[PDB]
Write a protein that binds this ligand. Structure first.
Ligand SMILES: O=C(O)Cc1ccc2c(c1)CCCCCC2
Length: 133
């Protein structure tokens, strides 16, 4: 009953500061423009200890499956090859990506009827709000 309140299909409804987050990560101009337009669906499911998070997008589709606390390889939608670890911290899913000596953290939390996604790179934060689809 790990992650029950996250499971489902979610649609992006608002975004703030995402272009600046992407810049800070190192995403190039054209990818930022096309990625920033997308209104993805995020599909979260659990089977035993394995959590799957899919992003269904007009930009890129992505899918990751993982066990909490257990590092995995991820190719991000902007084509970074990263080493990722996702944990639960006080009911928040904390996703850390490491690559080329850099690190970024994406937090997913349930707040009211929303799934709030906070993306942090150094001093830059972006907040993205998803609603049930
Ligand atoms: O899933 C989200 O809403 C947030 C989120 C965080 C990071 C990234 C994406 C999306 C995909 C687009 C490319 C930018 C870098 C990777």
């Amino acid at each position: 009953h790990m992650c029950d309140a996250f499971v489902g299909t979610w649609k992006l409804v608002s975004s703030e500061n995402f272009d600046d987050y992407m810049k800070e990560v190192g995403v190039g101009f054209a990818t930022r423009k096309v990625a920033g337009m997308a209104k993805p669906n995020m599909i979260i499911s659990v089977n035993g200890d394995v959590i799957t998070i899919k992003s269904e997008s007009t930009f890129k589709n992505t899918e990751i499956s993982f066990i909490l606390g257990q590092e995995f390889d991820e190719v991000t939608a902007d084509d970074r090859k990263v080493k990722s670890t996702i944990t639960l911290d006080g009911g928040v899913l904390v996703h850390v990506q490491k690559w080329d000596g850099k690190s970024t953290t994406i937090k997913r939390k349930r707040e009211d009827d929303k799934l709030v996604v906070e993306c942090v790179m150094k001093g830059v934060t972006s907040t993205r709000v998803y609603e049930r689809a």
